[PDB]
Amino acid sequence: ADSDINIKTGTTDIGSNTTVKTGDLVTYDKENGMHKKVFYSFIDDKNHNKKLLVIRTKGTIAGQYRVYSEEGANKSGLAWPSAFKVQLQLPDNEVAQISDYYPRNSIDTKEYNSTLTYGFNGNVTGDDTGKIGGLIGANVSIGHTLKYVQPDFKTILESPTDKKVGWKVIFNNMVNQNWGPYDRDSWNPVYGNQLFMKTRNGSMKAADNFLDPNKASSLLSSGFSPDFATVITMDRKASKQQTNIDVIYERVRDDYQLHWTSTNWKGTNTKDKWTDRSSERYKIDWEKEEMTN
Amino acid sequence: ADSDINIKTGTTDIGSNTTVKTGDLVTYDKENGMHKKVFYSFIDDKNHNKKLLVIRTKGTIAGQYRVYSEEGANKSGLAWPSAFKVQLQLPDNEVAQISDYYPRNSIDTKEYNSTLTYGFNGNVTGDDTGKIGGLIGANVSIGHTLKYVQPDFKTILESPTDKKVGWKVIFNNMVNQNWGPYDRDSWNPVYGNQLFMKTRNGSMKAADNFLDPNKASSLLSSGFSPDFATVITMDRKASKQQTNIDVIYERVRDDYQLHWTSTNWKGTNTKDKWTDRSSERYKIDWEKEEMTN
Amino acid sequence: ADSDINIKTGTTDIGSNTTVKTGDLVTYDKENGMHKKVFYSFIDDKNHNKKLLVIRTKGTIAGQYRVYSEEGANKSGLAWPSAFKVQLQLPDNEVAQISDYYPRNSIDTKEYNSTLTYGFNGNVTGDDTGKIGGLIGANVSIGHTLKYVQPDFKTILESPTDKKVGWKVIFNNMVNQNWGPYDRDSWNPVYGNQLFMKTRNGSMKAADNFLDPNKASSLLSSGFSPDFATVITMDRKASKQQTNIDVIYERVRDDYQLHWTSTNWKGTNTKDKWTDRSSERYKIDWEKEEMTN
Amino acid sequence: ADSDINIKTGTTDIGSNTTVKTGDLVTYDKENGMHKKVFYSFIDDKNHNKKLLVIRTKGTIAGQYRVYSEEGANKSGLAWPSAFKVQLQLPDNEVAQISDYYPRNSIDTKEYNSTLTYGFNGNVTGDDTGKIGGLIGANVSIGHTLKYVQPDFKTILESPTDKKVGWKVIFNNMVNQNWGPYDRDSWNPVYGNQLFMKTRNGSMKAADNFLDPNKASSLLSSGFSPDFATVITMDRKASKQQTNIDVIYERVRDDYQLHWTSTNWKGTNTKDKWTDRSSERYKIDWEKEEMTN
Amino acid sequence: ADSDINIKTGTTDIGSNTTVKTGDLVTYDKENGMHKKVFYSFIDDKNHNKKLLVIRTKGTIAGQYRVYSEEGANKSGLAWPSAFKVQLQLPDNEVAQISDYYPRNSIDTKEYNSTLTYGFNGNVTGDDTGKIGGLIGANVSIGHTLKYVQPDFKTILESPTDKKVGWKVIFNNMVNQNWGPYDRDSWNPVYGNQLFMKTRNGSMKAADNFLDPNKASSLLSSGFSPDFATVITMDRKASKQQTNIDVIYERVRDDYQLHWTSTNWKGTNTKDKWTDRSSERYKIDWEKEEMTN
Amino acid sequence: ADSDINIKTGTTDIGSNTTVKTGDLVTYDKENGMHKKVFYSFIDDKNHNKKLLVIRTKGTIAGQYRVYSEEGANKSGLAWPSAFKVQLQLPDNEVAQISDYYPRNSIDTKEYNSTLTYGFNGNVTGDDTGKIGGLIGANVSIGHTLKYVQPDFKTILESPTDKKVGWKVIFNNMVNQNWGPYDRDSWNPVYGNQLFMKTRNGSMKAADNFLDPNKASSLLSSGFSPDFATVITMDRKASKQQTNIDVIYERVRDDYQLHWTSTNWKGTNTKDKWTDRSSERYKIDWEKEEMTN
C-alpha cells in the first residue's frame, strides 16, 4: 500500500481531474442461455502515458442442470455445468494491449496440526477370594491433522498475454446430502461416482434419482454471474484509434449418468461432453470514447 | 476493486453531477398476504451511454404457517411456505433491458479435516502369587471431518435474461428442537418426516402436535422481506420512452400432514401443494422519470 | 449495495438538500411499567415522489420478573415476560401508507459436522510361563454434530400491511445455572419445567426458590428497549394532509409456578396468562411537519 | 440503519447548524470514595421539536475490597462490592423528561451443540496353543455441549420512567485461581463459599487467607468507572426554564467471612450488608444553557 | 502508526501539492510465457529532499505445469514451477538508488498447546456364582499440539541493495487429494515422492498418472501475478538525469518423474532443472518524467 | 483515545497548518550486507512547544544463513542470524532529546483451560454356560491446557533514554519440518540441538544435512526489514541548532554445527559467535530542516 512506502494514500492512482465516459451493453443469447453485460469506462487521464479502458464483464451464465436422456426406468442422464468461462481477446494486429485484470490467482493455504501424547497408568486389583492384582502400562501417540477450506467452484485467472485474458470458474467438489465431498473423479466399486446420486438403492425411475438442484450448488442450475475486470491501454499516438475486442462466454457441461445394476444404482461421469459458446465482437473507438456492438 | 487496478476508487461509478429522481410505490394484497413496495431511482447520467433505472423490490410476504385442516384428533394438516419468489418481467417487445441485479449466487464452501494417528503402548501385570506378564500393542486410525454451514433458507438468483429476472428464497433445512436438521425429504420408517412434529408419542390432538412457530424459522410464519435490486437500461434515442414492467410476488406452500398410526405420530410432506401469485404492472416513463401503477 | 451495480455510493438515497424536521415525544405509562418514546423525522425530499415520515419507537418496557404469588411454604408463583411487542397502525380511512420498516426477519443458520473414523490395532501377550497371545481388531465410527447459536430472545418482524406493522421480541430459551437451556415447554417427569427453579429439593419457602433475576436474562426484570423504525409515505396531493396513527407497547407474561411434591420441587409454566397493553394515538400533520400526542 | 430504509446516513440525526454548549462538573466524595463527574451538552436544535440535554455520568467508584474485621487467627471478615449503581432523578413536578439513555440491555446468547455417534468394531484373538477367538460389538452415544461467555460483572439498564433512570453494574461470578467460577451463592459442604478463599487449609491467620485483590476482578478493589448517557428533553415553551435533577452514585457491599473449622477453612457470604450512597443535586438552566451544583 | 506518536495521520507522507506523472508499459514474452507490465509513478515533491519513482511490477507469469517427456509407457516427466521471481537492477554506475520496496518478509508464527491430564477410577465386579471383585486405577497424560498455517507458496523479499531488489514466490508444500502435504523432498520408500502422483497402482501409462492441474494450486498451471512495488530515489542535482534499469521475470521449473516399478508407481523430483529468464531494459528520464522501453 | 475523553478526534495531534519537510537517505553496506534507509520528517508546528523530527529507520538487513565451514563429510558448520538490531544515539552533549518511539513492548497473553469430568458406567455380561455377571465403575479426571502463540522472532524495544533508543528482533523458536519448535537451547541426548538438522540419520555429507532455508524463517536468509520510528524534540531556543545522531544496524550470528556420531547426526549451537555492525552518522540541521549523511 502507498502508506507502506511513505506516500500519501491514492497519490499514484489514475483518474483524478478527468471526465470518465461509461457505458452499458447488454446481449441475451437465448440458444446458449447467457445474459451478457459489458460495463465499460474510458479514462483518458492526461497525466498518464496512455488512454485506458476498463471493461467489466458481468451478466449471468445459466447453469442448466437437467435430465436430458431417459432410456427406461433403469437408465437416465444428467447434463451439468463443470465450468463457466469468460474470455476477451484482441486481434493479433491491434496495437492496444491488455494491461491489467482482476481477480487473479490467490495462493491457497491449509492448517497443519501435530500432536504428541505420552501417558502412564497403574491399576490395583482384588477379589472376594483374596487375590490381589497389579497393572502398569505406558503409551505414546502421534497424530497429524490437515485442515483446509474447499469452495464448490474455484475461480481461476487463465494465463494472460498482451492480447488475451480470461477466467474459468471450475467445479471443484461438492457435498451430497452431508456426504463426500464428491468430484468428477470420485469412484466407489459398488456405486461408482455418487456425485449427483439421490438414493443408493431407491426403487424409483432413474430420471427421478438425481439430486434436487436446490440441495446442490446454485451455480449448477440457476447459474454463475461473472464480475471480472480487464484493463486495456492505448497509445494516444497509435495510428489507428479503433480497436476490436472479441468476448466469449462459455459453459462446459459434463454428462452424469445413473443405471440400475440389479441391486443398486451406479453413477458415471463423462467430462466435457458439451461446450456452449457465445461470442461477441465489440468496437472500441478511443477518440469518441465509446464502445459498441 | 478499483485500487487493484491502480484506479482512483469510485472513478468508474455512475451518478456524479446528476439529479436523481426517486419514488416509493406501495401495494398491499390482502388475499395473498403480501406487502409489496417498489423503491425506484432514475439516473440519467449524461456521461453514461444510456438512461438508467434502479428498481428495488422490498416489502414482505407473510409466511402463513398454519393448521388448515383437522380430520379428527388423529389427523391434521399444516400449510407452510417452502418458497418465496420475486420476479420482474419486461414484455418481449420492450427496447429497455435488464442490465444488472443484486444479490447474485455466491459459491458455497466447506471445510475438510483429515486426521491420522498412530501409537504404541506397553503393559505389565501380575498377581499376589509372583506371576509376571506383559502386553504390547500398536494402533492406527484415520478420520475425516466435514464442516458446513447451512442456512434455513437459501437466497437464489434465478437465471436472468434481458427481459426477465427473479429470485427465489427456498426452504433448505431446519433444526427441530435440537434434532435434525430436517428437510422436505427427511424420512424415518417409524415417524416419517419429523420436520414440524412437536412430539413423537404425544397423546394430544393432531392439530396440537405441530411445532411452535416461535421455535421454527421466523420466515415460515411472520414472513420474508425481499431486498432485491434490478437495474434497467434504456437507449436515449428510443422512439418510445415508456416501458411497461410486471412485478410478481409469490409464495409456494407445502402440505405437512400428521396422523396417528396407533403407537406414535407419523408425518408426511407434499411439495408445492399451493402457489399464491400476486402480479402487478407498472409504467415507467423515462422522460418524466417516474414510475406509476 | 450501490457499488455492486456500478453506481456511486449513496446516489440512490433520499434526503439530500432537504431540511428535515425532527421531534421527540415521551409518555410514561406507570400502570403498565412502560417508558414510551417516539423519535420522528419528516423528510420532504422534492426529488422523491412522496413525503416521508420516519417513526422510531424506542424507550423501554420493564420486564417485571417477580415472585408475585405465595400460597403457603409449598407453593409460589413467578410472573415473567414471555414477549415484548410494539405495533403501529394507521386507520382504514387514511391515505398515508407503511412503506418500510427495520429490523426485519433474518434467515437463521447452523453448522453441520460429519465425521467418519476407522482404525486397526494389533496386540501381543506373554507371561513368565512361556504363553504367548495375540490380538487383532478394527473399528468404524460415524459421528454427526449440530452446532448453533441460540439467543435468549428472538426479535421478529410481524407480517406487515400498508396500514399496520409490528415487532415481537419473544422468549426463546435460557441457561439456568450452567444447565439447560430450558424454554416454555421444558418438561421432566420428576421436576417438571425447571426454567426458573433455583434448587431441585432445597428446604426453604417456595417463594425463595426462584432464580435470582441477576442470573437470568436482564430483559426479564429490568427490561427491553425497543429500537424499531417505520417509514410512512404520503402523496403530496392527497386531500387530507393529517394522519392519525396508533402506537401500542405490549408485554405478555407467563406464570411459572413451583410446588413441593413431598421430596422435591416441581415447576409448571402457564403461557400468556397476562397481557399488559398500552396504546396511544398520535396526530401527524404533513403540512406543518409535526407529530403530536 | 438509515441505509436499510434508503435514507442518507445521518439524515435524521439532531445537532446540525446548532451551537452546542458543554460543561464538566466534578465532585469527590471522600467518605464514600467516589470520584463523580458529569459531562453535559445542551443541544437546542431549532429543527427539533424540543430542547435537549445529554448528561454523561462518568468518574469512578472505588471498589474498596478489604478485610474489615478480625477475631483471632480463626475468623476474619472481608467487605467487597457486589454492585455499583448510578441513578438520575427529576423531581416529580419537573416538566422536563428523560427521553433516552445508553447503554441499554442486550439479548444474551449461548451455543448449543448436539452430537450423535455410532460405532462398530470386531476383534480376533489367539494364543500359542492354537486357540482362536472372536469379538463383535456396537455402540451409540448422544452428547450435548453448552457454551457461553460469563462476564465478571453485568452492566444493566434499570427500568426507566420519564423521571428516573439508572444503571447497576452487578457482580456475576468469578474465577478463583483457575477454579469455579464462584458466585454469591456458591456452596460446598466442606468449604462453604470459596469465592475469595486463598487456601483451603493454609496454616495462616484468617485475615491473611483472602484472595490477593490482584488475582480478582479489578473492579472489586480499584473500582468501576461509569460511562452512562442520559438524554433529557424540554418544551421550549415551558414557563419555567430551570430544572432540578438529583444524581446518585452507590456501592453495595457484601460480607465475606472465613473461619477455621479445625480441619479446614470455610467461607460465608452475606448479601447487601452495607450500602454507600452519595447523592448530589444539580441545577439545569435551559436558557443560559448551563448546569451547576 | 502516526497516531501512536501523537502526529496527525498522514502528516509525514510524500506527495501533497505535487503533480504526479504515471504510465503503463506492457511486454509479452511468448517464448517464456510471461505477461509483463510496469506501472510507474514519478513524484517530484519539492518538500521532499529527492525525486522519487515508484515502479510497480505486475502482469502474470504462466505456471506451465506440463508433461514434457515420455520415455515409453512406464516413465514420464512433468515440468512444474517451483519458483516465480521478479527482480529490478540498476547498473552499478547509476546515481539513482533503490530506496524502498513492498511487500517485505513477515515474521511467521505458530500455536503451541500443552495439556496435562490425570484421572482416577474405580470398578466393582460380580457374577452369578457370588464372586465379587474390585479395581482401582489412576493415570496421567501429557500432550503437546503444534498448530501451523502453511501456504502453498511463500512470497519472499530477497536481500536488496541500493542497486538491486527482487522477490521470489517459491513452492512450499501442497495437498494431493487430501493427502500430504507433500514438498520437493517428500519421500516414501515404496512410492518415492508422491507430490503430483495421481494413482499409486493405476494401470494407465505414466503420462496419464500426473495430478490433474485443477486439483493442484492454480499457480502451477495458470500462473502467478506479481504485485510488487519498488521505490527509486534520485538526487535533483545529479548531472545525468537519465537512468537505465533492468527488470527480470523468471520461472524456475522442477522435473517430477514417475516410473512403474513392477508393482506400483514411484516418483522422483529434480530441483531447478530449468530456468526461464526474461529480461528487459527500461529508460528512466527524470526530467521528462517518463519511462520507456 | 480522544473520543474516550469526550474530545474531538485528532484535536491533540501535532502537525496541522505546518509545512513538513521530508527526506530519504540510503546507504548500502556491502561488507555487512545491509541496505540502510532513513526517511525523515521535520515538523515545526508553531502551536507545539518544540520542533520535532520523526526518523524512520527502514531498509533490510540480509539474514545470511549459510554453510561457512566443511571439515570432512562428518562435520560442517552453519552461521545464522539469532538477532537483528537497529539503534539510534545522540551524543552526550546534545540538547535535542529522544521523545517517543514506535513500536514498543506489548503485554503477551496466553489461554488457560481447565476441565473436570466424571461419570459412571454399567456392564452386564453373560455366556452359554449360564454365567450372568455385572460391573459398575466410576471415574473422575482433571486436565488443564495451556495455549499461546509463538512468533519465530520477537520484536523488542530496548530500554530507551533521552539520548538512545533501539530495537532488537531476536530469534525465539521455530518449527523444523513439523517437529519442535526448537530454540537456541534445545537439547536431545541423542541428537543434541536439532534446530537446523535436515535428517537424523541421512548418509549425505554434513554440509548437505542442514535445513533448506525455504523451509525455515525467511528472516534467516533473505532478511529482516526494520520499520521503526523515533521522534526527536528540540527547543527552538537551543543555542546550537545542529544535532548529530549515530545509527547502528546490526546482525548477531550463531554457529550451528552438525557432526556424525557414527550412528546418527548430532547438532550443536553456539550463541553470538559473530556480530556484524554498520554505523552511520547523520547531521540534523533544525534551521534548514535537513538531515544528511
Chain A, nearest residue to F40 by Cα: A6
Q: Kindly provide the b/e burial profile for residues F102-116, where b requires at least 16 CB atoms within 10 angstroms of the residue's own CB.
A: beeeeeeeeeeeeee
Number of H helices, E strands in chain F: 1, 17
Length of chain E: 293
List chains touching D (3+ CB pairs under 8 A): B, C, F
Q: List the one residue out of E58, E87, E103, E59 whose CA is nearest residue E277.
A: E87
CA distance A192 to A200: 10
CB contact under 8 A, A6 and F56: yes
- CA–CA distance, C27 with C9 (Å, rounded to integer): 38
| Sign of the alpha-carbon dihedral angle for C62, C66, C68, C69 | positive
Q: Residue F42: closest CA among chain E residues belongs to which residue?
A: E12
Tell me the chain B residues in contact with residue C114 when contact means C-beta distances shorter than 8 Å. 145-146
- Per the CB < 8 Å rule, is D105 touching C35? no
C-beta separation of E36 from E24 below 8 A: no
How far is it, in rounded angstroms, from Cα A86 to Cα A84?
7
**F124 contacts F137 by C-beta, under 8 angstroms:** no
Helix (H) or strand (E) holding F134: strand F132-151
The β-bridge partners of F251 are: F84, F276
Closest CA of chain B from E145, distance in Å: 13
CA distance B234 to B253: 37
Q: How far apart are CA D68 and CA D224, in angstroms?
A: 21
Alpha-carbon separation of residue F130 from A128, E128, F126 (angstroms): 21, 9, 7
DSSP codes of every residue in D203-225 = SS-GGG-BPPGGGS-HHHHT-B-
Place of cell 465450468: A83
Contact yes or no for B180/B173 (Cβ under 8 A): yes
A144-167: b (≥16 Cβ within 10 Å) or e: ebbbbebbbbbbbbbbbbbbbbbb
What contacts 24+ positions apart, CB below 8 Å, involve F11-16? Answer: F12/E6, F13/E2, F13/E3, F13/E6, F13/E7, F13/E8, F13/E9, F14/E6, F14/E7, F14/E8, F14/E11, F14/F43, F14/F45, F14/F48, F14/F52, F15/E7, F15/E8, F15/E11, F15/F43, F15/F45, F16/E8, F16/F45, F16/F47
> E129: how many CB neighbours lie within 10 A of its CB?
8
Q: What is the DSSP string of E26-89?
A: EEEETTTTEEEEEEEEEE--TTBSSEEEEEEEEEEE----EEEE-SSSSEEEEEEEEEEEEEEE
Contact A32, A276 (CB under 8 A): yes
Q: Which of A176, A178, A188 is the mutation pick for testing C, counting most C CBs within 10 A?
A: A178
Partners of residue A229 on adjacent β-strands:
A56, A102
CA distance B106 to A152: 10
Write the burial class of residue F127 (CB in 10 Å: 0-12 exposed, 13-18 middle, 19+ buried): exposed
Annotate E186-198 with b (16+ C-beta within 10 A) or e (fewer). beeeebbbbbbbb
Q: How far apart are CA F247 and CA F159, in angstroms?
A: 16
Distance from CA of F193 to the nearest CA of A (A): 19
Pair A245, A98: CB distance under 8 Å: no
Show which of residues 42-101 on chain B sit within 8 Å of chain C, judged by CB atoms: 43, 52, 54, 58-60, 62-63, 100-101
- Using only C-alpha atoms, chain F has a radius of gyration, in whole angstroms, of 29
Which helix (DSSP H) or strand (DSSP E) does residue E220 occupy? helix E218-221
F292 is in which domain, residue-wise?
1-293
Sign, CA torsion B124/B126/B131/B137: negative
3-state SS assignment for residue B254: strand
Closest to D286 (Cα-Cα) out of D238, D250, D249? D238
C13's grid cell: 438515497
Q: What φ, ψ does residue F98 adopt, rounded to 5°? A: -80, 125
Residue type, D151: P
Could you tell me how far CA B182 lies from the centroid of its own chain?
16
Q: Do F151 and E107 touch (CB under 8 A)?
A: yes
State whether residue B233 sits within 8 Å of chain A by CB.
Answer: yes
Q: Find which of F178, F227, F228 to mutate to test the A interface (most A CBs within 10 Å of its CB).
A: F178
Tell me the three state secondary structure of residue B221: helix
Q: Is F112 on the interface with D (CB under 8 A)?
A: yes
Beta bridge mates, D142? D116
- Smallest Cβ–Cβ distance between A112 and the set F22, F56, F178 belongs to F178
C-alpha F263: how far from its chain's center?
Answer: 36
Residues in chain A within 8 Å Cβ distance of B100: 37, 39, 58
* Bridge partner residues of F120 (DSSP): F138
Q: In what order do the strands lie in the sheet with A228-234?
A: A21-29, A34-43, A51-61, A228-234, A97-102
User: CA A170 to CA A238: how far, in whole Å?
Assistant: 38
Residues of B in contact with E229 (CB under 8 A): none
SS3 of chain A: CHHHHCECCCCCCECCCCCCEEEEEEEEECCCCEEEEEEEEEECCCCECCEEEEEEEEEEECCCCEEEEECCCCEEEEEEEEEEEEEEECCCCCCCEEEEEECCCCCCEEEEEEEEEEEEECCEECCCCCCCEEEEEEEEEEEEEEEEEEECEEEEEECCCCCEEEEEEEECCEEECCEEEECCCCCECCCECCCCECCCCCCCCHHHCECCHHHCCHHHHCCECCCEEEEEEECCCCCCCEEEEEEEEEEEEEEEEEEECCCCEEEEEEEEEEEEEEEEEEEEECCCCEEEC
C-alpha cell at position A241: 484509434
Cα(first)–Cα(last) distance of chain F, in Å? 37
Q: Return the bridge partners of C250, or none.
A: C85, C277
Radius of gyration of chain A (CA): 29
Residue with cell 554434513: F206
Question: Hey, are the CB atoms on E39 and B6 less than 8 Å from each other?
Answer: yes
Could you give the 3-state DSSP secondary structure of residue C94?
A: coil
Handedness of CA A178, A183, A186, A190 (dihedral sign): positive
The resolution, in Å, is 1.9
CA atoms within 13 A on the CB side of B81: 30
Structural method: X-ray
Let me know: does F136 contact F124? Beta carbons within 8 Å.
no
Q: Which three cell numbers stand for residue E216?
A: 493442484
Q: How far apart are the C-alpha atoms of B35 and B57, rounded to whole Å?
A: 11
Q: What CATH number does residue D224 fall under?
A: 2.70.240.10
Q: Which residues of D touch C24 (CB under 8 A)?
A: 48-50, 52, 99, 233
Q: Which residues contact D185 (CB under 8 A, 6 or more apart)?
A: C212, D193
Of A6, A114, A144, the CB nearest to F39: A6
Cβ–Cβ under 8 Å, residues D251 and D83: yes
CA distance D177 to D117: 35
Give me the residue from E18, E37, E143 closest to A117, CB to CB: E143
CA separation for the pair A217, A227 (Å, rounded): 18
Q: How many domains does chain A contain in total? A: 1
Residues of chain B by 3-state class (helix, strand, coil), percent to 5: 5, 60, 35
Distance CA F6, CA D47 (A): 25
**In the Cβ-directed half-sphere of A128, how many Cα atoms lie within 13 Å?**
9
Q: How far apart are CA B17 and CA B22, in angstroms?
A: 16
Per DSSP, the residues of D9-21 read: TTTT-S-TT---E
- Round to whole Å and give the CA distance between B13 and A22: 8
